[PDB]
Symmetry: C4
Subunit: 208 residues, 4 copies
């Protein structure tokens, strides 16, 4: 649990994200909870050119390391960590299916039982606010109070979990749910959903 081991994992997650089809270009940003703040990917630098020393430390006051420029979206990573004390890693990307659902400004309802992985019977869609602002941060903190992932209107996705592996896994699962929703929505509106009682059983089984 040293800085260099955590910085490698961040970089590996960025790579895996691109391999999975979730990250296009310079879109995503990944962070881990560290000491009193977090370690996050830098702004600008292409994923494949990323080295361990590129990773940026931002303390709990929002002061970033000297000589580095953190992701332009670091503020909502810090919002996630303060709103969900159990979150230790945050993955943000502009995955195509999730982003298309966020353009329609729709929550993803319970079309599949794996929706319970984010904590409830839906994936919310937080209202639009300019990237990097305090207004965006507040919408994100409110959307993550009872969910581990949220869409961002006209923007993309944020997923948080107990470690990077799980955070990536959830982000990928939400992109599948988004794709399922858009494919079925093009055929029938509304899309058949599982009832709240059924999601309630699946949530209890997921605890077990």
């Amino acid at each position: 649990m040293e800085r260099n081991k955590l910085a490698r994992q961040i970089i590996d997650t960025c790579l895996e994200m691109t391999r999975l089809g979730l990250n296009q270009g310079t879109a995503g940003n990944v962070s881990v909870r560290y000491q009193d703040g977090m370690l996050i990917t830098p702004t600008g630098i292409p994923y494949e050119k990323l080295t361990e020393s590129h990773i940026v430390f931002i303390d709990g006051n929002g002061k970033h390391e000297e000589g580095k420029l953190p992701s332009s979206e670091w503020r909502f990573h810090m919002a996630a960590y303060q709103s969900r004390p159990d979150a230790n890693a945050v993955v943000h990307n502009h995955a195509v299916h999730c982003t298309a659902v966020s353009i329609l400004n729709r929550s993803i309802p319970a079309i599949h039982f794996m929706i319970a992985a984010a904590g409830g019977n839906s994936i919310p869609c937080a209202p639009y606010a300019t990237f990097g602002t305090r207004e965006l941060s507040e919408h994100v903190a409110l959307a993550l109070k009872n969910r581990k992932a949220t869409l961002l209107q006209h923007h993309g996705l944020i997923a948080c979990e107990v470690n990077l592996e799980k955070a990536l896994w959830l982000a990928h699962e939400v992109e599948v749910l988004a794709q399922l929703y858009l494919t079925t929505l093009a055929i029938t509106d509304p899309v058949p959903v599982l009832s709240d009682e059924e999601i309630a059983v699946v949530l209890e089984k997921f605890k077990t």
Copy 2:
């Protein structure tokens, strides 16, 4: 036909499944008929971290090996083996196209002559029941009486065949048929189909 050779094949099938775009995350489970029960993938463990000793033996009574946790969906693998004595391998996944069709709760009709590979003029869609329950198992056993593959409402796909290679091959073919169906359904409803007499000729030719 030793346990270790069969466990490698299971693992290779999981890998190939992910390579083919049919398996996302920790979704699929694969099994082979063995001795008086089966060998199946474990619950939890990521596909890429899978080693031969991770594969779990479940006897015909449903007792699993000591110290291992079988897939959470082992019960419908056992249902498949008891309902179709000719089945020696079972592939389950949550492939996107198949799962989207299962959300609409539709059978795939004879839109292409390759539908005959699953035994008839359609791919059925068995009704929803919570994962891992006896209720789900009974729907699966009934859907596989005269078909080698079935969709599972709000869930995914099960395909069975005489060996893993063929089971994977069928699962992939059903994902293509699902994609064909959804792409054409978005344009015209209903989708043109081949008549039962024509599927009857194709089935006789497939025996030859």
Copy 3:
């Protein structure tokens, strides 16, 4: 221009076809004009297990080499060669977009100027007939009289050209045109097309 060099190219084309996303499972078959007949891929054998000695010679009378089983669809390869004397290689597959258009039983109209690569202002769709029959062969020979590629209703695609490289290239281009057509058809019907005068200029430029 020896048999072994031509058999390698067939195998390389099968591999490239799978790499390009045009061939799923055991669906495609590839042939080259040779001596008085052709060399074609065998029936059954997975693409990755294909060796040079697996390639089958079928003479101009339809007699195939001893101990080998040619593709089950060899008859329409022979139909192509007899209908288009300038064709030296034939690529057949069940590519998803082309096959979805063939299910709707539609020709692809001139939605893009690259449609001229197949010889005219459209890609035809020949009527359904059981695979491997003389009836299918006759529809294919008639569709290829003034076109180098045709869809096959409820089935897939055939493309022919002067060598394998060009035949593969055309097959890939027709899969792109099919995808363009289905994506736009889901939005507006009918799809805007280029006029015959414009396709006439593009065809003259393609000669130059």
Copy 4:
């Protein structure tokens, strides 16, 4: 900044373009501003067979090097360079989503804030003209006056930027925006957009 270093980058961009899913077959062409004209990819030659000595120099008068045949679309590369003095690299391809939007003859509106990367609140669609003509060149020069990328009706995409890395990056981003637009258009028409005031803030933030 020698010719051979610039020719490698062109070739690397062609390869990366194919890897990204933006270039199918022999469709794209890439150029860089050089001396008094440009270096561009040749006509005909497959991307994978491309060597440094294949790259063609075209002076500012349109005279091309002896013994080489420049891309058939070099004229609109020269149009781009003369219309946008700040452009140093041009990427053209027939990416599927962009091309499908160009078939509908629609501009992409501000459905996502990344639309500001091309300079404004939209990606224009320049009217159809035969490839390689002066008429096409004039439409392209007019579309790029206040935008760094444009669709070409019934054809594809052109993107220009300060170097090849950025030009490729923009071309990829526009293909994502096209995909977002088509996916949402199939569900609802018109698609929700961000207001001009909001795009105005995002453009100021992108300067900062």
